[PDB]
Design a protein around this ligand. Structure first.
Ligand SMILES: *[C@@H]1O[C@H](CO)[C@@H](O[C@@H]2O[C@H](CO)[C@@H](O[C@@H]3O[C@H](CO)[C@@H](O)[C@H](O)[C@@H]3O)[C@H](O)[C@H]2NC(C)=O)[C@H](O)[C@H]1NC(C)=O
Ligand SMILES: *[C@@H]1O[C@H](CO)[C@@H](O[C@@H]2O[C@H](CO)[C@@H](O[C@@H]3O[C@H](CO)[C@@H](O)[C@H](O)[C@@H]3O)[C@H](O)[C@H]2NC(C)=O)[C@H](O)[C@H]1NC(C)=O
Ligand SMILES: *[C@@H]1O[C@H](CO)[C@@H](O[C@@H]2O[C@H](CO)[C@@H](O[C@@H]3O[C@H](CO)[C@@H](O)[C@H](O)[C@@H]3O)[C@H](O)[C@H]2NC(C)=O)[C@H](O)[C@H]1NC(C)=O
Ligand SMILES: *[C@@H]1O[C@H](CO)[C@@H](O[C@@H]2O[C@H](CO)[C@@H](O[C@@H]3O[C@H](CO)[C@@H](O)[C@H](O)[C@@H]3O)[C@H](O)[C@H]2NC(C)=O)[C@H](O)[C@H]1NC(C)=O
Ligand SMILES: *[C@@H]1O[C@H](CO)[C@@H](O[C@@H]2O[C@H](CO)[C@@H](O[C@@H]3O[C@H](CO)[C@@H](O)[C@H](O)[C@@H]3O)[C@H](O)[C@H]2NC(C)=O)[C@H](O)[C@H]1NC(C)=O
Lengths: 346, 346, 346, 346, 346
């Protein structure tokens, strides 16, 4: 006899003086709530909004001496979420929620079991859209650090303390991959204790290091910006002194270079500073604009101008072509060395 | 006399000791819940978010010996959703919900009938937005496998086991078509039993094989990329040695080829690897860029340069034109053989 | 004396044995619920999602012999939605809901009146986002047929039957117009009785024939595609044998023709088959691409090439121009006859 | 003594026979509910959906003789929204809701006070997304008339009548401006009484005349369409008889004119008819396309062609240039007079 | 003994005559509620909608003499949100809500503590989407002032007065940064007392001065608009009297200048007036269009035209080139001085 749901209504009901509005160990030491999470889903990391969506299993463990049964033979008593509002629960929240919700499909997704000595496991499923500030100084090569922090709202430090457990405080699902990022295995765990004019409130947080996948931006933004500089080096071969087509190749490789420089920031926040994709576009814009300034310098030296003088201004307008045909694969190559050593090391 | 709604309140009410917070066969064998789904709607398969929306009829069948009436003459007793929170129900959920809801139009869309021996049918309507990781290595020719899995949240393996029924575990509606995909008839059914630090929980899943319709990408992305290579072969005929228009056709078929290569990935996730639509664009980019590098080689050989020597540099700059007029329909044709046999077989 | 709300609480309350969980005519003939709708709003007919939004007044009429009062002098008793969950209601739903909601502004928008013999009128306001598969074979000239179907969820055919009433089963508001479509006056009304593994369930449906307004696509997509073919016929007049500008007009009218062919499908689903707007773009793409292949054929015949021989290759390269200047207004006109007779008849 | 909340529970509670399900003046004259609104926010007037969002204070005043206290000394008794569902309220709704909601921040935003003679003031805050059909025949110069109508849902004309009050039936906030429109001060107030097959229901409505701000469309769409016609008049000066650049200026001013004609309708509904911005684009498309047909006519007359005959065809191909250089500032100016007098008067 | 939750149910329950529907100091002086906020998150400041999203901690302090306990030994009694609807609360709302919500993750995020003398602290977490009208006369250099105002809804001025506290009435989080703006430290605090036809209602508000970051618009919109003017100055060097390429550089630098002038207002509201980014685009449009009107003036003077007369029309068409090659770096530089002194001072 003695089923658990009838027995546990005796443990927390009208008799035995249990009050769900009062924390355990009242007028004594604070409640030590230890926590760990299990990340089911991760991603949709937007940058116009600067937020990310996570789907976690928030597990909470504390001790409640009023729920310590002694004569019931089992070791754990589950509690379905119909009677979930009948015991004490910590008032945990996230300091960067930006909208969140539970999951209530076919049953309230809430887990609650009570051990013999009073250890209470409390596991719920939460979908969060957490805010993290994006630092985009070196944009295709940055390592973002987006955090999540777990505060108390109504209980101060002298009544309720949050801790991480030592046995794997952040678990990650097995095949959890990201379309644009990779989640590094080392996850920092530190304190974030807040001081308001109301009091000091407990806080624990977990950093997540997000490294980008450079392989996408190496296809769309780097190679067509490297192919268009080779396209601007075709103008050094067309008719070798003067043409109406070297102007047509000098203009047109600045046009789509301006479009690709403007199209590279189509889905980005309007940040105040210069980033890594800017000084790849705004330096390769010089290598396609100096190729048209050269033909403007050739067509002014060649068409300026006797017998002796004919040997002068023709050998001077050919010296501009056959030297800058090789000098631009030296200036563009010495920048391409300097660009990647600056950013791949950082 | 004895109406069912008054009779069944005797079966589960205050008398007879029925408690909806306690599973059937308590302190005994686990509850064997068998399930099958009926897909009403399918689709809106996004790839930026990597998710799909489904609209199912979730049927659940278990046995409850406390609900086994004997003296009532009927074989089945329906139960409207007003008294739905009064019997035991399995706490099923989806491990990749990503937000979901019920349907509550004109009545809570819930079905519940109880047989004589205790068999309980439970059919509800759920709209899900399920997550599936997209593998886009061969993008217009891939066969996606998007899954859905049905776990328990509060009952472990020794208390509740999920199964698929043998009589058509996944039904599909009659005229259910997809705008971009086709749903294959063979649907895999296997186990996905999860191990956490709380316990081990039951899980059953059903795979759906989604094959794309290549007919859309054969019109927008393949034929204008095949027409623009024919457009670049017009330059082998214009004035046959030298023109200011062969540059104008050499530049311009790289411009919109760059735009079509960039516009082909307008609604795609920023994946790290190269896909099948990339190495169709980034190889046909060579066939429109080598056609301009040829005229840069023709205009350097023809305009380089006597009586005997005049026969040399004219017959040499015409040999470049009349051979590569036929060689490029050999190189582009030998790639076009190699590109489709690689991907249509896989 | 005897107010209705006090009298009707006697009619359905604890006394007289009324039970809102039991259908009328129990253990007898099925309940014949007759229905008609009033479409307030219609439209926002998307095609990427293939759905439409409607705003209806759902009226339901059935008979309930337990509500047949006799001695109260009035003919009808209204029932405000505070006591709405106290009588029986049919569990109607829509088989293609895709999310829906009620309207609860300043009062629950629900109407309920009870006649003397037991006739119960029940009118509620529902906003639906209904799904309909789009058939886009002849896209600017198609007649779409989007339906809505009204099923029962928990009551089978032997307990509850849906019917349309004979007195105008679908009413439409007076000034209801659509931005892209016109709603035809003939609305089909037929049965859609579903067979599941649970039972057979009643279903009635209403077809809505949606004919497009071709006047939008006649301005944006047809006239600039007809103007660009006239633009390609300008090249037959420029210098009459050879120019570096006939190449520039031959290239450029393929460029924006490719963009307009790609821009015409900017807000469309990725369907597997070819549609009517495709073979207007992909045939007028030939009339702007054959005009450049002609000048490539002229510049190869003119620049190929004596005294007698001079009369040959000049009269042959002029014969190509002065015949195809008139032949292309014959080939483009004989397609334009064949294109519209195929689609305006269907 | 005698606080209001204890006194008013006597006025509407179990004693005195008050029933909130029964309208005042029952079996008598209908209830005359007078209404006025206060528009806090207005705007976000979309045209793809053809709707606008408003944020109003809906005030309702009626008479309830059962709430007419006599011996309590005050003149008004406020009623907080905790007891809001305990007296009678009219079932007002909007016939063009398209989704709406209340505001429940820190308290249900509901006001309710009861005078001595029975006058009841009832003020709530509603956010509406109201539908209005857009008439876009003269699109940048139209005066839109978007309405809002307030019906009853359960009470017919012989039980409940809506009226506007004479003392400012529509108030507008002080600094309420709009980004694209201006709200005219004259607001029409008329009746909209509906007839259904259920009965006839009361309805009152208020028209809002919305005049556009033409200053935006005068910058983006009119001046670059007027600058590009001046750009097409540059071709009458370049080399004065024949050039390969007059073709290049003739083609290119049709290209971006086609893009600006297509880009002007980027965020507009797909209406069946022609509008005012169309016949500014589709007439200035002629003035940039006839300028290229002129050079095609010049290059056919000049290059057609003796001593006497040389004076003929040179003075004939120059007569085309020097007359149409001045005739096009006469034809484009006589249309520009005719265009604005047609639309600014209407 | 005497736990707080049992003691406080005596303080506000059935005994002691406490009524939560009645404000403190009834029939006396008004309730002086003092407020201060803590901005957690700020931003997503849209301009098409003209709104911003804030995430605040709304603290409210007032005095309630009915809650002034005397014999309980503690100084403050917390109150969890399960009993939150049992005492009096001010009916605060925001006059520009535009939709808002609470936060209910793992507990209702509400704080409530009661001191000994009756001081009641009440702190809740609210997410707001507040409306502010944008003034965009000088668009990249403006200082926006977006406000938030806190009114009462049901209590007039003679019953409830809102105030700001003197001890830091608006606190901001530590590392709160914005992607496009910076939040100035001086925050104005003034009154906004409203007068309706119902009464006069209290209101307090806080101004937030938002200054833009000009560094984004200095990269995308200013440098490619300054590079294209240098690109138009290349045409003064190409062949120095006449070319078919100076037309090709005169047309093309107007094309993308028109696109950049249209693309700069891609995500902006359709305002009626001219802004700062307009008269940078619409003046640099003149410097790229007058460079083509010069070559049309050169090609008409040079190609107009003896021995003496040959020296006239060649020295006249070269005087146009060599003077306007230096005059345009004087006119564009004297505007660039006048443009920034006008706007950076304001
Ligand atoms: C929750 O965790 C905190 C911190 O782990 C516990 O506080 C600690 O409690 C112990 C025993 O009450 C304290 O030790 C005591 O130290 C004092 C000198 O400070 C001395 O009288 C004894 O040596 C005694 O052992 C310890 O100082 C204290 N630490 C802190 C930081 O407060 C708390 O007891 C835990 N509460 C529960 C309910 O488990
Ligand atoms: C739910 O399904 C499971 C699996 O089908 C059932 O468990 C099975 O129960 C039977 C009978 O209790 C077990 O057979 C027994 O085998 C043992 C040796 O293992 C031996 O003493 C007898 O031969 C006896 O027949 C069977 O092993 C067991 N299988 C597993 C995997 O546990 C369970 O009974 C079902 N529960 C209900 C309520 O239907
Ligand atoms: C709801 O509507 C259905 C169909 O209109 C009604 O069913 C019909 O009921 C009548 C009278 O009970 C049946 O007529 C009977 O026919 C049998 C032979 O079939 C014979 O014994 C008599 O001639 C008798 O009149 C009729 O067959 C039956 N039709 C069907 C398709 O079932 C039903 O009665 C209606 N229920 C209510 C509550 O109005
Ligand atoms: C609500 O407003 C309506 C309309 O303003 C009121 O109806 C009006 O009531 C008066 C007095 O009952 C009627 O006057 C009567 O006219 C009849 C001839 O029609 C004659 O016997 C007398 O001369 C008498 O004065 C008036 O006709 C009637 N008007 C309409 C259109 O029905 C109604 O009484 C108001 N109800 C309340 C509760 O204020
Ligand atoms: C809430 O705050 C208001 C304003 O701070 C308080 O109103 C003020 O109350 C005091 C004392 O009742 C008034 O002083 C009195 O002035 C009159 C002449 O006006 C004279 O008889 C005495 O000199 C007396 O001190 C003061 O005028 C009044 N101010 C206003 C603007 O009304 C109110 O009492 C506060 N309520 C609570 C509950 O704290």
């Amino acid at each position: 006899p003695m089923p658990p749901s009838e027995f546990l209504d005796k443990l927390m009901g009208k008799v035995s003086g249990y009050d769900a509005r009062i924390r355990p160990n009242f007028k004594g030491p604070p409640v030590n709530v230890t926590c760990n999470i299990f990340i089911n889903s991760f991603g949709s990391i937007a940058e116009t909004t600067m937020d990310y969506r996570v789907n976690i299993f928030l597990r909470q463990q504390w001790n409640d001496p009023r729920l310590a049964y002694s004569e019931y033979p089992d070791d754990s008593l589950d509690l379905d979420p119909s009677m979930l509002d009948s015991i004490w629960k910590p008032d945990l929240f996230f300091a960067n929620e930006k909208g969140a919700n539970f999951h209530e499909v076919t049953t309230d997704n809430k887990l609650l079991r009570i051990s013999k000595n009073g250890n209470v496991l409390y596991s719920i499923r939460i979908t969060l859209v957490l805010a993290c500030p994006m630092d985009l100084k070196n944009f295709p090569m940055d390592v973002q650090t987006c955090i999540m922090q777990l505060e108390s709202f109504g209980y101060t430090m002298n009544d309720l303390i949050f801790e991480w457990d030592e046995k794997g405080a952040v678990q990650v699902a097995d095949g959890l991959t990201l379309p644009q990022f990779i989640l590094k295995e080392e996850k920092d765990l530190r304190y974030c204790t807040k001081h308001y004019n109301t009091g000091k409130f407990t806080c624990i947080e977990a950093r997540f290091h997000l490294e980008r996948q450079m392989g996408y931006y190496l296809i769309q933004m780097y190679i067509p910006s490297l192919l268009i500089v080779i396209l601007s080096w075709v103008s050094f071969w067309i008719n070798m002194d003067a043409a109406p087509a070297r102007v047509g190749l000098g203009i047109t490789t600045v046009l789509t270079m301006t479009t690709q420089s403007s199209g590279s920031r189509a889905s980005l926040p309007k940040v105040s500073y210069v980033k890594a994709i800017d000084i790849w576009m705004a330096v390769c814009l010089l290598f396609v604009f100096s190729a048209l300034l050269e033909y403007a310098a050739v067509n002014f030296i060649a068409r300026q101008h006797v017998e002796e003088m004919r040997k002068l201004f023709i050998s001077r307008a050919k010296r501009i072509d056959t030297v800058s045909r090789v000098a631009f694969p030296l200036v563009f190559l010495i920048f391409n060395i300097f660009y990647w050593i600056t950013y791949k090391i950082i």
